[PDB]
């Protein structure tokens, strides 16, 4: 299932978050536009608590057409997560209608 992130004028942001050990999360976000307009120059950071180690495979893409979705997305785990609430971080910066964009927050992960 998808965790809603984020929903901004411009842009969605879901994770799937899934356990697959007693100290490893998959965590993978779903970026869809939701502007007629393209969205370039997309920038994804995100942050997890100290005690954990996040390790994300690259981008797939900086760049999605007026209304694509899951135009772009980023695969991860978060290593040092035990069973036993995750906080996260993150950041957003992009281009859309000749403007520059940026959304931030801070995210909790439902319990996996």
Same mark, same amino acid.
């Given at each position: 299932?998808?965790?809603?992130?984020?929903? @901004? #004028? %411009?842009?969605?942001?879901?994770?799937?978050?899934?356990?697959?050990? %007693? @100290?490893?999360?998959?965590? !993978?976000?779903? =970026?869809?536009? &939701?502007?007629? @307009?393209?969205?370039?120059?997309? *920038?994804?950071?995100?942050? *997890? #608590?100290?005690?954990?180690? $996040? !390790? $994300?495979? #690259?981008?797939?893409?900086? =760049?999605?057409?007026?209304?694509?979705?899951?135009?772009? @997305?980023?695969?991860?785990?978060?290593? %040092?997560? #035990?069973?036993?609430? $995750?906080?996260?971080?993150? !950041?957003? %910066?992009?281009?859309?209608?000749?403007?520059?964009?940026?959304?931030?927050?801070? =995210?909790? &992960?439902?319990?996996?």
């Amino acid at each position: 299932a998808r965790t809603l992130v984020n929903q @901004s #004028p %411009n842009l969605k942001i879901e994770f799937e978050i899934s356990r697959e050990s %007693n @100290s490893v999360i998959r965590i !993978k976000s779903f =970026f869809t536009n &939701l502007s007629s @307009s393209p969205i370039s120059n997309l *920038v994804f950071l995100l942050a *997890v #608590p100290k005690s954990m180690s $996040l !390790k $994300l495979q #690259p981008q797939s893409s900086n =760049f999605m057409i007026g209304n694509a979705k899951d135009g772009i @997305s980023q695969e991860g785990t978060i290593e %040092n997560a #035990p069973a036993n609430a $995750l906080k996260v971080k993150w !950041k957003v %910066n992009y281009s859309v209608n000749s403007t520059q964009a940026e959304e931030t927050a801070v =995210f909790t &992960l439902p319990n996996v």
